[PDB]
């Protein structure tokens, strides 16, 4: 199928409690495979998936240097952004970066991504062209100009089109038994009366990978979007995911409602009813 | 593999 790799960086200042913490995590699709934490007793890049462990010392030290140097630079960046916004030295602030590459089903680069935020709001992003920037405000414009002057976009592009795709493909091959395996949802419908004249129908999807899934209730073939209660897809802790969707229906109209399930791992899309 | 360090100075924001 299609696949992506993303690194997620978080740099958090904490005045009076030491220097800013830097954490980085790496993912292939919905599988985390590495972490680095500057607050660890001995900060180093650590494996978080079995298929990455075969990488040699050279790889681990290469990652660690990258993350150590970034830790320092993000400290500088936090100082700079506090100034760009004329902020006091008293508050805590966060820079986030998420970046990586997407491959289509044939292993080719679909597109690159490189987005940053400050205090949870879009700050600066690399455009799909991998050449130009979008800056959210006049503060971000200062970064844009700095990044233009230093030819930063060319650096990002070369990574996203080169090393990013090459290493993603390596990981996909090495972890093919899991990374390229879609596990379909196990499903069922439960029924719980809420009163004499209403009942809850809950459609369940358990044990699926990847997280992407579509779960909907229909009444008489019409989507019940506004009346459906839909929880966020949640990790089970064994790599798989869970989700449910609930509708409250007139007692006796149960058979007029159908749960539809779309997931990559299903040989066929699913249509379920409550089965008394 | 994350983005490698550049040949020069890593550019801060």
């Amino acid at each position: 199928g299609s696949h992506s790799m993303r690194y997620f960086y978080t740099a958090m200042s904490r005045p009076g409690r030491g220097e800013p913490r830097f954490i980085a995590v790496g993912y292939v699709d919905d599988t985390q495979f590495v972490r680095f934490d500057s607050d660890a007793a001995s900060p180093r890049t650590e494996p978080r998936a079995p298929w990455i462990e075969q990488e040699g010392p050279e790889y681990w030290d290469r990652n660690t240097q990258i993350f150590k140097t970034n830790t320092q630079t993000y400290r500088e960046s936090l100082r700079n952004l506090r100034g760009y916004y004329n902020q006091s030295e008293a508050g805590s602030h966060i820079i986030q970066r998420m970046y990586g590459c997407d491959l289509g089903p044939d292993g080719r680069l679909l597109r690159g991504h490189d987005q940053s935020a400050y205090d949870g709001k879009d700050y600066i992003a690399l455009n799909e062209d991998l050449s130009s920037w979008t800056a959210a405000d006049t503060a971000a414009q200062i970064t844009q100009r700095k990044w233009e002057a230093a030819r930063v976009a060319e650096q990002r592009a070369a990574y996203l089109e080169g090393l990013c795709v090459e290493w993603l493909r390596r990981y996909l091959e090495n972890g093919k038994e899991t990374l390229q395996r879609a596990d379909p949802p196990k499903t069922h419908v439960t029924h719980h009366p809420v009163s004499d004249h209403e009942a809850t129908l809950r459609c369940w999807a358990l044990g699926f990978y990847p997280a992407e899934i579509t779960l909907t209730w229909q009444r008489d073939g019409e989507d019940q979007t506004q009346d459906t209660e839909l929880v966020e897809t949640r990790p089970a802790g064994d790599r798989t995911f869970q989700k449910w969707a609930a509708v409250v229906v007139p007692s006796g109209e149960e058979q007029r409602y159908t749960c539809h399930v779309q997931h990559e791992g299903l040989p066929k899309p699913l249509t379920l009813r409550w089965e008394p | 593999l994350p983005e490698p360090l550049p040949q020069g100075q890593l550019t801060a924001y």
Partner: protein, 99 residues
């Protein structure tokens, strides 16, 4: 500007009394990233609890999974207790095996 956490409490596997399982508390959609999460057994804090590495969603909000091994019974009560700058007091969500 800040975002308050969403909270879900649930088990890794479908619950069966007297069978070993995992109790999960998934906290998501929050900003900034400092957050305090306890799992409770009969209202008391459980000591050995692990969590996932800090990461975030496409809208920049953070998420974390807290988890511990447990064996559900019919009488024992479990819950997740969360605090965050957005909350005036810690929020408690009970574990309901049907949710």
């Amino acid at each position: 500007i800040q975002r308050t956490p969403k909270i879900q409490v649930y088990s890794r596997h479908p619950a069966e009394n007297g069978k070993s399982n995992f109790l999960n508390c998934y906290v998501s959609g929050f900003h900034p990233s400092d957050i305090e999460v306890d799992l409770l057994k009969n209202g008391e804090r459980i000591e050995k609890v692990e969590h996932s590495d800090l990461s975030f969603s496409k809208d920049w909000s953070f998420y974390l999974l807290y988890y511990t091994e447990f064996t559900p019974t019919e009488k024992d009560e479990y819950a997740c207790r969360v605090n965050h700058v957005t909350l005036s007091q810690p929020k408690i969500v009970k574990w309901d095996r049907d949710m």
